[PDB]
Amino acid sequence: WNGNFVFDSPISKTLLDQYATPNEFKFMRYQAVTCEPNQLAEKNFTVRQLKYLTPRETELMLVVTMYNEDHILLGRTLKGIMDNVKYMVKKKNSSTWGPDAWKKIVVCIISDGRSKINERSLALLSSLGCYQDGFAKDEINEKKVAMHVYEHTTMINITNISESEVSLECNQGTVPIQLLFCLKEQNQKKINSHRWAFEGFAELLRPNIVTLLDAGTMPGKDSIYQLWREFRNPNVGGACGEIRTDLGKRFVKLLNPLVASQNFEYKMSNILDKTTESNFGFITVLPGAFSAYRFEAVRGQPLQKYFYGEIMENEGFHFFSSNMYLAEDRILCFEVVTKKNCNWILKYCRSSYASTDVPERVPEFILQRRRWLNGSFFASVYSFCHFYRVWSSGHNIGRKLLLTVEFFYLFFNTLISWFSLSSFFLVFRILTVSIALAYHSAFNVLSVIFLWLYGICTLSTFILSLGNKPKSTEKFYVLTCVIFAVMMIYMIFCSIFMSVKSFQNITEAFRDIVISLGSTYCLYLISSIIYLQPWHMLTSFIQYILLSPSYINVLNIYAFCNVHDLSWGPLGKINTTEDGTFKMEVLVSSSEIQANYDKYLKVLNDFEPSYDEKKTGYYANVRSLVIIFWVITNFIIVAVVLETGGIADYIAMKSISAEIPLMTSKASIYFNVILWLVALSALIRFIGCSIYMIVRFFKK
Amino acid sequence: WNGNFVFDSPISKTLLDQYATPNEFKFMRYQAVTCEPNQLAEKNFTVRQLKYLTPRETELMLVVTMYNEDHILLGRTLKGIMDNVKYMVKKKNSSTWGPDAWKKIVVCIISDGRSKINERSLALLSSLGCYQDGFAKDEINEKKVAMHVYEHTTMINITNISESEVSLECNQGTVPIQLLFCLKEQNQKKINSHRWAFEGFAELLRPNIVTLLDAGTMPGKDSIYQLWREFRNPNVGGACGEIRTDLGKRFVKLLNPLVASQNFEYKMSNILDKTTESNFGFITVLPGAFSAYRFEAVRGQPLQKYFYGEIMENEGFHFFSSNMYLAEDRILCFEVVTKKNCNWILKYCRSSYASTDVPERVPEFILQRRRWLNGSFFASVYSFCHFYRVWSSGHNIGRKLLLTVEFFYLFFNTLISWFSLSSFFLVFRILTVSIALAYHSAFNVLSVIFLWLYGICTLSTFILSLGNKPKSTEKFYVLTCVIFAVMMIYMIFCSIFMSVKSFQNITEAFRDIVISLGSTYCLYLISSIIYLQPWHMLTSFIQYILLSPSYINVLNIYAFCNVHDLSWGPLGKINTTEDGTFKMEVLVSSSEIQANYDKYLKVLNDFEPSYDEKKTGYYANVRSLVIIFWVITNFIIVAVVLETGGIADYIAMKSISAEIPLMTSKASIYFNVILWLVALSALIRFIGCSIYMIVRFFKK
Ligand SMILES: CC(=O)N[C@H]1[C@@H](OP(=O)(O)OP(=O)(O)OC[C@H]2O[C@@H](n3ccc(=O)[nH]c3=O)[C@H](O)[C@@H]2O)O[C@H](CO)[C@@H](O)[C@@H]1O
Ligand SMILES: CC(=O)N[C@H]1[C@@H](OP(=O)(O)OP(=O)(O)OC[C@H]2O[C@@H](n3ccc(=O)[nH]c3=O)[C@H](O)[C@@H]2O)O[C@H](CO)[C@@H](O)[C@@H]1O
Ligand SMILES: [Mg+2]
Ligand SMILES: [Mg+2]
């Protein structure tokens, strides 16, 4: 048909039996896509939405990218989607959604790898009627087929998902859903799945909004509709929602101390950072979040530089052009906001949420955060370096000024996060030596012991992150996290104990610690109260404080030590039937003997590797230059403050031209500066959250 | 023939033409070896030496192992061998060698990899008549052939090797040579080549002595005979010779400062360490050296534990059993010396030498020394741990005592080499702070600058050795070596300057530096004079002193950071002739549709990796535990001596229960202890060399 392989094989008699309990419900269509994603329209490839008597104008296209997820995660995502669609078809007073909105929504499941996909998921997919085995082809007319497209409109919905089963039923209350199962055949990464979603089927369907989901992310009963409502404002070019950690049956997972930490971290992030950024107009949407992008807004330059990167490039490598892939989705946001002659803004929707599952062991936690930290660091660097693009866009003067201010503040936060390695050690060492030097009881030996414990855990973390893999050594990482938590406890004890003794004595530089610690805690709590989600402030808060030194001295170290994933990397056969082989006049020729010799004589008379190894060498050099600069700059700060690195020796020698004192006023000055910075950051984020809630309330 | 593939195809008419200028000169025999090395005799595989009317009893078997060497290196080795054979056939007053000794010597060339071999070498090999293309088979009777054996007795010899050609002639003065070209087909390592040499063809030939050569190692005009003469003493179970760096045409390569360093290092090693060990009776033969092993001595337990390792082992891993492969050839020596009920000794022959080619760039130099350092470290650890085996052997009481003493002294040297990382820094820092503290002029800033330069070059060396590869970053390694050489120059200047000023003033702890530095230099020079090879003592000596800090702070770091090489790591096709394909009743069946669905339904109802990854994880853990212990122990020494690591702070706090002084007497005590150790080592090696020369002279 039209030069492409197609097939319409009716679904199983069983499925068709319940579906009946029109043509598109009754056949399942297959399509062998053998072209590039950016050639779907010109190759005469189409989708059923475009074949009926009246073509279907789609309003919302939902992309689910699955790699090897079990049927539970995918079933969770699909159940969320079907619940949303049922809500949107039961809506009464609405111009867009209605009893036939099931026709304006398309679900696109871009599976990755025919080898990698879990059959557990294909069981669910075929049970829904969007897939069946037998007619998947491996190459068509000397061309390898790039992916397989199965299209069905199933009338069944998942209504219950226990810990082991998914309940599929077909009643008068179920709604049809337009599935579209894409299935790549070889393991190309997530960016290629997005390339198929955006440059491929979105070019044929022409949706209004394009929503990106993952496998295992459950949207709420009402989340997708609330995210769709954000695009009423014609200036909105993107949006995102809140991300909740799901705690399992009656919050059983809170007993794990690595899940409570992430619960508090997620809810703090959503309450403070997302609202503060959304006030200005530019967001940097969280990885696990589900986002939506107006097709017109992302169409053109944003997509082009998200997929291919900076085109202007010679045969050699350039820094931003060849590393931008580390900040994958955060380039779409930056290019949408700063589009030329266009005033798109990014908005954060709090009425839309989705509950995802978080890692529960340290190895996978570290491996997950390795991508987040690198992405956030490179995205901030790039966005700060290219802030002049804000003044070439179409925004008004006030919105350009606001975006410039936000880009400066984001780089300020990145600069703070870069020096955390030295900041934590400086605070810890100054505090432990100050209390020892003031009270003398047993804190001298504790100071020495804790200095040595940190150094044995920092050195080992560097070495294992540079050479080993987290899965190989999990017990050591658990031990390191426990040791850092104990050090945190000791730091808290020192601060409280000296503050209490100074209160009894009344010093300023230590009673100030009480002043700030209370201010930032109260700002956190007041923001939580205003956001109307305050239970995290006590339920899962302590574990965040204890596993916070391990987020600054383990996740950061592994993230920086693993910037890029560097993977370095006949004739003749005899089978005699029975003591007898094949004879001939070949070789017997003597002239050939003088001819299979003269050639060899001449070869004793006559007297850079591929692009992959070159790119790998460049990536390794970049990774080892970043690490070295990080360590050197942090030690520069430490040696300037504590007078380590032989500086105190040098000053003593100049004075002789004496001996080293125990502590100086630089320690006090630095100790005040750090808490001032922390207080300023907390104040800024509190003000941002307050403005967000006030504006939202007035608009509502 | 006998169930194995054979072929006797006369050599090229050209070759045969000059050979004539008997049967074995005229045919070249091929053999497809499809068994294991330890099965050659039982498989009814033989070699021509065993087929004549009178079987040939071989006296000397020479093994040359080549991997991808050009025809120049292999031609060099072959020319050395043919010169030796000519010398041994022209000998007059000898019971063994004579006009027919060409019959008692077999050359075995165990090439590795049909894919890896350089055709440049096959040109030379076929030009000699020991190889010709066309009848090499890839598998025989459903069995893959393991290697190809070509056997010829060529009458041509190489008589001149210019920089670009090898001169092959056939006169009345040439001698026949019994070549035997082994050619493995897949890249198995050198230990498997030795397994073929020892468990394979040596089992058929039954030689008296087995000599191991490499491609590119040129034995002298008389070296092999002088090595053979060492086995007259029935107690000798092995032997080795001197290794000379060849300097090229009129010593042009001495202009390179990385070749002069290795020249001096090699000649010092041969003069001191080999003679000192050979006095006791156990040697640990240098890597590039060519060695000989009596077959009876190595036959049995030594070979068995060289090839397979410790047999007693459960499913899990053990340290020595699973890492002994790092000390490859040094296990043969240890097992020969300590053989049960046998009194074999290892002797060092100085009358036999061989000139090899040394690396001239820093990346390949580091990569070469990475194997030497790991091998020497593990071999010393194993030999010290198993010294009790010396008292279970057959030696007399005095020789057991001598071997025990030697094993203790070797581990003492290893223990010294383990702490060199801290020793160098301690000496450097104490010296630079002492001169600054005494003279004040400009040495304060130099002390700070040099402390920072060392730390920026040590940190970078750790990071690049752990993450990167030497070939990727050569400029930085050159820069680091230059910086370390400048630091060495500054240390020498400080020592000389303070010693001169103390001489003018007359302190003891610095004029002592002059006392030792002169004693060790004079012992070096006197040993060189006695060994009668004194030109290295001035020609290539300075470059060894300047590139010595880079042998302690670059080769060691890379060797320890790279202990083991950790490499982590369908149906359907359509080709329509013309808009028409293959149709059938397959799939059309509806029952199958309900059958390709019920299976999937059930798969949604039903509700450690391989040995390689486990071994890789174990190896990585071992590598990262060794590194951590090395760094921790060296810093323990440094912090105890210099009172770093917060110890001085702790002592000051106890005294308050004051402030840190600049330097203590621990620095003086350590500084004296180090030079005392150096003087003791130099004295021991000088005495060993003197005893060696005196004994050899008296015996001669
Ligand atoms: C290197 C690594 O171990 N990554 C970890 C991390 O990354 P992280 O969670 O960032 O990444 P995910 O693998 O979860 O990727 C998110 C989306 O990508 C799809 N998709 C598609 C193609 C592809 O190559 N990769 C891919 O992930 C995924 O199923 C999902 O749809 O998350 C999890 C920890 O809880 C673990 O699964 C992993 O240990
Ligand atoms: C990892 C590495 O880079 N090794 C380096 C080093 O090791 P090094 O010199 O120790 O090792 P060699 O490769 O020279 O090995 C010696 C003998 O082994 C044969 N043989 C056989 C099989 C096999 O797998 N390997 C093998 O080496 C060799 O040709 C030779 O006959 O020496 C040289 C530096 O000047 C370089 O060639 C290499 O950069
Ligand atoms: Mg997931
Ligand atoms: Mg070689």
Round the CA-based radius of gyration of chain B to a whole number and report it.
31
* Amino acid letter, A288: G
Enumerate the residues of chain B whose CB falls inside 8 A of the CB of residue A165.
Answer: 605, 607
What single DSSP character describes residue B554? Answer: T
- Domain end residue (candidates: A320, A339, A356): A356
Comparing CA positions, the residue from A277, A302, A220 lying closest to residue A410 is A277
Comparing CA positions, the residue from B451, B447, B425 lying closest to residue B436 is B447
CA distance B17 to chain A (A): 11
Query: CA-CA distance, B499 to B431, in Å (whole number)?
Result: 12
B326 token code pair: 């790092």
Best of B440, B474, B649, B651 to disrupt the A interface (most A CBs within 10 Å) is B649
Q: Is the dihedral of CA A207, A210, A214, A220 positive or negative?
A: negative
Query: CA-CA distance, A461 to A471, in Å (whole number)?
Result: 14
Query: Is residue B568 in some structural domain?
Result: no
B550 token code pair: 């880079």
Query: CA-CA distance, B306 to B175, in Å (whole number)?
Result: 36
What single DSSP character describes residue A28? Answer: E
Three-class DSSP category at B619: helix
Atom of ligand 1 nearest to the CA of A565: 1
CA distance B439 to chain A (A): 9
Comparing CA positions, the residue from B140, B79, B78 lying closest to residue B109 is B78
- Domain end residue (candidates: A356, A371, A404): A356
Interhelix angle for A474-505 vs A508-530, to 10°? 120
Q: Are residues B103 and B212 in the same domain?
A: yes
Query: CA-CA distance, B375 to B292, in Å (whole number)?
Result: 20
Enumerate the residues of chain A whose CB falls inside 8 A of the CB of residue B460.
Answer: 628
Is the CB–ligand 1 distance for residue A66 below 6 Å? yes
Three-class DSSP category at A320: helix
Atom of ligand 2 nearest to the CA of B188: 24
Is the CB–ligand 2 distance for residue B328 below 6 Å? no
* Amino acid letter, A303: L
Atom of ligand 2 nearest to the CA of B358: 35
Bridge partners (DSSP) of residue B240 are B348
A399 token code pair: 């919105």
Q: Are residues A320 and A459 in the same domain?
A: no
* SS3 annotation, B6-26: EEEEECCHHHHHHHHCCHHHC
CA distance A405 to chain B (A): 37
Comparing CA positions, the residue from B137, B115, B139, B117 lying closest to residue B126 is B117
β-strand pairing of A209-214 with A291-294: antiparallel
Is the CB–ligand 1 distance for residue A295 below 6 Å? no
Round the CA-based radius of gyration of chain A to a whole number and report it.
31
- The answer to whether B290 and B217 have CB atoms below 8 angstroms apart is yes
Query: Is residue B604 in some structural domain?
Result: no
Query: Is residue B588 in some structural domain?
Result: no
Q: Are residues B351 and B443 in the same domain?
A: no
Comparing CA positions, the residue from B380, B386, B409 lying closest to residue B279 is B409
Phi and psi angles of residue B651, each rounded to the nearest 5 degrees, phi first: -65, -40
**Starting at the edge strand that comes first in sequence, how are the strands of the sheet with A27-33 ordered?**
A6-10, A27-33, A147-154, A177-184, A105-111, A60-66, A209-214, A291-294, A236-245, A345-356, A218-219
Task: Extract long-range pairs of B164-173: CB within 8 Å, 24+ residues apart.
Answer: B164/A607, B165/A607, B166/A604, B166/B71, B166/B72, B166/B75, B166/B79, B166/B124, B168/B127, B168/B128, B170/B18, B170/B19, B170/B21, B171/B21, B172/B21, B173/B86
Is the CB–ligand 1 distance for residue A189 below 6 Å? yes
Query: Is residue A408 in some structural domain?
Result: no
The Å distance, Cα B66 to ligand 2 centre, comes to 9
Instruction: Give B5's contacts (C-beta < 8 A, 6+ positions apart).
Output: A574, B30, B31, B32, B137, B140, B145
Q: Residue A13: which of B9, B13, B594 has the nearest Cβ?
A: B594
Best of B598, B600, B613, B621 to disrupt the A interface (most A CBs within 10 Å) is B600
Q: Where are the alpha helices (DSSP H) in B288-329?
A: 295-298, 301-307, 319-323
Query: Is residue B576 in some structural domain?
Result: no
Bridge partners (DSSP) of residue B161 are B166
Three-class DSSP category at B210: strand
A621: exposed, middle or buried (Cβ count in 10 Å: 0-12, 13-18, 19+): middle
H-helix or E-strand spanning residue B599: helix B590-603
CA atoms within 13 A on the CB side of B360: 11
Phi and psi angles of residue A351, each rounded to the nearest 5 degrees, phi first: -70, -10
Query: CA-CA distance, A55 to A205, in Å (whole number)?
Result: 10
Query: CA-CA distance, B183 to B111, in Å (whole number)?
Result: 5
Max Cα–Cα distance, chain B, nearest Å = 112
Query: CA-CA distance, A260 to A543, in Å (whole number)?
Result: 6
Is the CB–ligand 1 distance for residue A527 below 6 Å? no
**End-to-end C-alpha distance for chain B, whole angstroms:** 53
* Amino acid letter, B604: L
CA atoms within 13 A on the CB side of A83: 18
Chain Cα centroid distance, residue B330: 10
Q: In chain B, after which residues does the backbone break, taking C–N over 2.5 angstroms as a break?
A: 21, 506, 569, 607, 657
Q: In chain A, after which residues does the backbone break, taking C–N over 2.5 angstroms as a break?
A: 21, 506, 569, 607, 657
Bridge partners (DSSP) of residue B179 are B107, B152
- The answer to whether B77 and B64 have CB atoms below 8 angstroms apart is yes
Q: Are residues B152 and B216 in the same domain?
A: yes
Bridge partners (DSSP) of residue A128 are none
Other C-beta atoms closer than 10 Å to the C-beta of A451 total 20
Comparing CA positions, the residue from A113, A116, A119, A140 lying closest to residue A30 is A140
Query: CA-CA distance, A215 to A125, in Å (whole number)?
Result: 13
Instruction: Give B363's contacts (C-beta < 8 A, 6+ positions apart).
Output: B470, B471, B474, B477
What single DSSP character describes residue A516? Answer: H
- The answer to whether A275 and A688 have CB atoms below 8 angstroms apart is yes
Query: CA-CA distance, A60 to A78, in Å (whole number)?
Result: 15
DSSP string, B466-522: HHS-TTT-HHHHHHHHHHHHHHHHHHHHHHHHHHHHHHHH--HHHHHHHHHHHHHHH
Please indicate whether, in this complex, the C-beta atoms of A463 and B120 are within 8 angstroms of each other. no
Other C-beta atoms closer than 10 Å to the C-beta of B569 total 8
Q: Please report the number of interchain residue pairs, chain A to chain B, with beta-carbon separation below 8 angstroms.
A: 262
Query: CA-CA distance, B111 to B148, in Å (whole number)?
Result: 10
Query: CA-CA distance, A562 to A626, in Å (whole number)?
Result: 10
- The answer to whether A346 and A283 have CB atoms below 8 angstroms apart is yes
- The answer to whether A488 and A549 have CB atoms below 8 angstroms apart is yes
Q: Are residues B478 and B372 in the same domain?
A: no
Query: CA-CA distance, A225 to A352, in Å (whole number)?
Result: 8
Cα dihedral angle (A420, A425, A428, A434), rounded to 10 degrees?
Answer: -120
Q: Are residues B55 and B178 in the same domain?
A: yes
In chain A, whose CA is at the least distance from the CA of B660? A660
Domain that holds residue B185: 1-221
The Å distance, Cα B189 to ligand 3 centre, comes to 43
Query: CA-CA distance, A171 to A585, in Å (whole number)?
Result: 81
Enumerate the residues of chain B whose CB falls inside 8 A of the CB of residue A569.
Answer: 569
Q: Considering its fold, how many domains does chain B have in total?
A: 3
H-helix or E-strand spanning residue A242: strand A236-245
DSSP string, A153-220: EE--EEEEE-SS-EEEE--TT---EEEEEEEESS---HHHHHHIIIIIIHHHH--SEEEEEETT-EE-
Other C-beta atoms closer than 10 Å to the C-beta of B298 total 23
A482: exposed, middle or buried (Cβ count in 10 Å: 0-12, 13-18, 19+): middle
* SS3 annotation, A85-154: HHHHHCCCCCCCCCCCHHHCEEEEEEECCCCCCCHHHHHHHHHHCCCCCCCCCCCECCECCCEEEEEEEE
Experimental method: cryo-EM
Atom of ligand 2 nearest to the CA of B67: 29
Query: CA-CA distance, B551 to B545, in Å (whole number)?
Result: 10
Could you give the C-alpha distances from B117 to B158, B403, B550, in angstroms and in order?
21, 42, 34
Query: CA-CA distance, B341 to B530, in Å (whole number)?
Result: 37
- The answer to whether A97 and A235 have CB atoms below 8 angstroms apart is no
- The answer to whether B369 and B252 have CB atoms below 8 angstroms apart is no
CA distance B308 to chain A (A): 27
CA atoms within 13 A on the CB side of B456: 17
Q: Are residues B458 and B368 in the same domain?
A: no
Task: Extract long-range pairs of A410-413: CB within 8 Å, 24+ residues apart.
Answer: A410/A277, A410/A284, A410/A380, A410/A383, A410/A384, A411/A380, A411/A381, A411/A383, A411/A384, A413/A380, A413/A681
Query: CA-CA distance, B293 to B237, in Å (whole number)?
Result: 6
β-strand pairing of A218-219 with A177-184: unpaired
Other C-beta atoms closer than 10 Å to the C-beta of B320 total 14
H-helix or E-strand spanning residue B65: strand B60-66
Could you give the C-alpha distances from B455 to A652, A677, B461, B465, B470, in angstroms and in order?
21, 31, 10, 15, 20
Three-class DSSP category at B584: coil
Comparing CA positions, the residue from B118, B10, B14, B100 lying closest to residue B54 is B100
Phi and psi angles of residue B244, each rounded to the nearest 5 degrees, phi first: -110, 135
Three-class DSSP category at A382: helix
Comparing CA positions, the residue from A527, A537, A525 lying closest to residue A692 is A527
Please indicate whether, in this complex, the C-beta atoms of A119 and B603 are within 8 angstroms of each other. yes
Comparing CA positions, the residue from A248, A147, A246, A170 lying closest to residue A11 is A170
Please indicate whether, in this complex, the C-beta atoms of B561 and A596 are within 8 angstroms of each other. no
Enumerate the residues of chain B whose CB falls inside 8 A of the CB of residue A448.
Answer: 645-647, 649-650
B515 token code pair: 């006392």
Enumerate the residues of chain B whose CB falls inside 8 A of the CB of residue A135.
Answer: 572, 587
Q: Are residues B402 and B427 in the same domain?
A: no
B206: exposed, middle or buried (Cβ count in 10 Å: 0-12, 13-18, 19+): middle
Q: Are residues B351 and B491 in the same domain?
A: no
Q: Are residues B631 and B691 in the same domain?
A: yes
Bridge partners (DSSP) of residue B168 are B158
Query: CA-CA distance, B250 to A189, in Å (whole number)?
Result: 59
Query: Is residue A213 in some structural domain?
Result: yes
Query: CA-CA distance, A325 to A617, in Å (whole number)?
Result: 17
Phi and psi angles of residue B110, each rounded to the nearest 5 degrees, phi first: -90, 90
Please indicate whether, in this complex, the C-beta atoms of A568 and B596 are within 8 angstroms of each other. no
Please indicate whether, in this complex, the C-beta atoms of B649 and A662 are within 8 angstroms of each other. yes
- Domain end residue (candidates: A356, A382, A397): A356
* Amino acid letter, A434: S
Instruction: Give B137's contacts (C-beta < 8 A, 6+ positions apart).
Output: A572, A573, A574, B5, B32, B145
Query: CA-CA distance, B242 to B355, in Å (whole number)?
Result: 9
What single DSSP character describes residue B196? Answer: I
Query: Is residue A503 in some structural domain?
Result: yes
H-helix or E-strand spanning residue B33: strand B27-33
Comparing CA positions, the residue from A687, A419, A544, A650 lying closest to residue B445 is A650
Enumerate the residues of chain B whose CB falls inside 8 A of the CB of residue A161.
Answer: none
Instruction: Give A262's contacts (C-beta < 8 A, 6+ positions apart).
Output: A245, A358, A359, A365
Other C-beta atoms closer than 10 Å to the C-beta of A302 total 24
CA distance A570 to chain B (A): 7
Q: Are residues B112 and B33 in the same domain?
A: yes
* Amino acid letter, B524: Y
DSSP string, A4-26: S-EEEEEPPHHHHHHHH--GGGT
- The answer to whether B406 and B282 have CB atoms below 8 angstroms apart is yes
Instruction: Give B208's contacts (C-beta < 8 A, 6+ positions apart).
Output: B58, B59, B60, B231, B294, B295
B253 token code pair: 């390569």
Could you give the C-alpha distances from A431 to A437, A510, A669, B308, B658, in angstroms and in order?
10, 9, 13, 57, 19
Could you give the C-alpha distances from B76 to A604, B153, B287, in angstroms and in order?
14, 19, 18
Q: Which ligand is nearest to the CA of B67?
A: 2
Interhelix angle for B13-20 vs A590-603, to 10°? 90
The Å distance, Cα B407 to ligand 4 centre, comes to 30
Query: Is residue B567 in some structural domain?
Result: no
Q: Are residues B374 and B283 in the same domain?
A: yes
- The answer to whether B592 and A132 have CB atoms below 8 angstroms apart is no
* Amino acid letter, A425: F
Which residue's CA is the closest to the ligand 1 atom numbered 9? Answer: A368
Cα dihedral angle (B523, B525, B527, B529), rounded to 10 degrees?
Answer: -150
Other C-beta atoms closer than 10 Å to the C-beta of A281 total 18
Other C-beta atoms closer than 10 Å to the C-beta of B624 total 23
Enumerate the residues of chain A whose CB falls inside 8 A of the CB of residue B464.
Answer: 624
